[PDB]
Design a protein around this ligand. Structure first.
Ligand SMILES: CC1(C)OC(=O)C=C[C@@]2(C)[C@H]1CC[C@@]13C[C@@]4(C)C[C@@H]5C(=O)OC[C@]51[C@@](C)(C[C@@H]23)C4=O
Ligand SMILES: O=C(O)CNC(=O)C(=O)O
Ligand SMILES: [Fe+2]
Ligand SMILES: [Fe+2]
Lengths: 277, 267
């Protein structure tokens, strides 16, 4: 297994092969320069006023003192919720990853990944560690989550670009963390995206440049799992402008399981019916 | 199958749950409370009842939306929270409401298939019988539960069976005989089934169910009016999905960005 840089027009069966083989890859030109600049324009004041460091106390202390990870992106970015969440590559991969086992999937969470100059290396980790059921899951099973880390600024070795350990997703539970010397930094242009299944060991690097390294992420997981981020605080007019696909992603529609059982229902009917969506 | 009084110590009930997989708590509710839920539900659906001579109806929604007693009193029942705290707490942290249904077997209904309640969790095929349950059901009886009217039957000890084990034989199913107000405790791994109602009258009752906070509930209560959410207790607000949940590792799920959902919605 190795790091792979594939173009946008890669066949889907080739991408899922690399995900099955190496557990990660980079899709170049995942977004265009227009979407990158629009996302930066919408979250500029948000991230600037956000305070560096975690917001609350939890066990996985992987938020550095010089790191900003604001979420709430569907609420603070129109391009995020109207276009980014409808990205065909995300839904093409998510359908083949969760479909045959869980049925529907929806949005788990998504945050800005902002590395201030001088930030040290993030601890190497798997994204699904905050799932208690990850101890039950064998590495042959489908992943509990998948992440889409999109570069807004450049991602270099020196400015703290994300590093992955290809092949570490196939390790059995309890396997020790990969050594730092085994981490492989990811080189990305603005708009490129690194695909991170919940089982791939990875971490942010140290930002040893004079300029911040900023990315932003989306993540999806099976519909039977509670998302880290709710969206019932969003204004009603926002939901009605969302596509039906994004409405389901953000928790406003009933979800169907793989055997046609429904969860997230309003009584016995659909949640969208009782709300008038 | 154990029948225990209401004042049974919590440690005793959890011990019988671990060993037998089910039991009944007699007088779980007073007969008044169970009756009020039905009356409030009937007053909600407002089905047309024809009189003896000639001379605005809603479909059934969530039980917490239909019945004020259900969402304000039944969902705050200390016995359910005492059991859910000890079954989900150490492993999962928070728990919340999974789903609730009105259980009415009309006269003539055949025997329901024997099943486990956690069969619709795909992750049930990774769980070991000694692991904590994925969900727990509390079935409260409004009418009497008898053999003839199709009262629920259980197979004690079948919760320890390996995954893939065959369903228990019908000859080895134990009928649960409950008076109005009692409640049958059904963890997700207990093999059970409703019986055949061979009497002339309905078998009435309802159920609540809870599961770990990291699992998506069967029912969403997002359509509930804001006035109803505000009058709920903070415990019930979290139960019905209006509050941020805390995992065992103190990582929060169901947040509003990085903060709490109840703070963003002004609860
Ligand atoms: C910083 C920390 C503690 O670091 C960790 O080591 C491990 C896991 C989490 C709890 C992150 C913080 C929030 C999460 C949640 C989310 C669904 C969406 C967030 C995101 O977009 O990037 C971080 C994401 C993550 C990709 C990883 C996961 C993900 O699954
Ligand atoms: O910021 C990055 O490059 C990578 N961040 C993470 O993996 C995280 O925050 O979980
Ligand atoms: Fe991560
Ligand atoms: Fe059942």
């Amino acid at each position: 297994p190795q790091l792979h840089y594939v173009p946008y027009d890669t066949p889907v069966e080739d991408v899922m092969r690399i995900l099955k083989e190496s557990g990660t890859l980079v899709i170049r030109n995942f977004l265009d320069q227009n979407t990158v600049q629009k996302v930066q324009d919408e979250v500029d004041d948000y991230v600037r006023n956000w305070n560096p460091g975690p917001k609350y106390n939890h066990d996985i202390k992987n938020v550095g003192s010089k790191t900003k990870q604001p979420s709430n992106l569907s609420l603070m970015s129109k391009t995020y919720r109207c276009e980014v969440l409808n990205h065909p590559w995300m839904h093409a991969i998510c359908e083949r990853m969760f479909g045959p086992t869980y049925g529907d999937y929806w949005f788990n969470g998504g945050s800005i990944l902002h590395l201030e100059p001088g930030e040290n290396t993030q601890p190497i980790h798997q994204d699904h560690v905050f799932y208690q059921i990850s101890k039950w899951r064998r590495p042959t099973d489908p992943d509990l989550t998948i992440n889409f880390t999109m570069a807004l600024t450049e991602f270099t070795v020196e400015n703290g670009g994300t590093r992955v350990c290809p092949g570490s997703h196939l390790w059995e539970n309890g396997h020790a963390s990969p050594a730092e010397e085994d981490m492989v930094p990811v080189l990305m242009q603005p708009g490129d995206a690194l695909i991170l299944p919940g089982s791939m060991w990875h971490s942010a690097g140290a930002n040893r440049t004079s300029e911040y390294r900023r990315g932003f992420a989306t993540s999806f997981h099976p519909c039977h799992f509670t998302p880290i981020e709710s969206h019932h605080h969003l204004p009603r007019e926002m939901v009605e402008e969302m596509t039906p696909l994004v409405q389901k992603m953000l928790g406003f529609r009933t979800l169907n399981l793989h055997n046609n059982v429904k969860v997230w229902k309003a009584g016995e009917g659909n949640l969208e019916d009782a709300t008038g969506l």
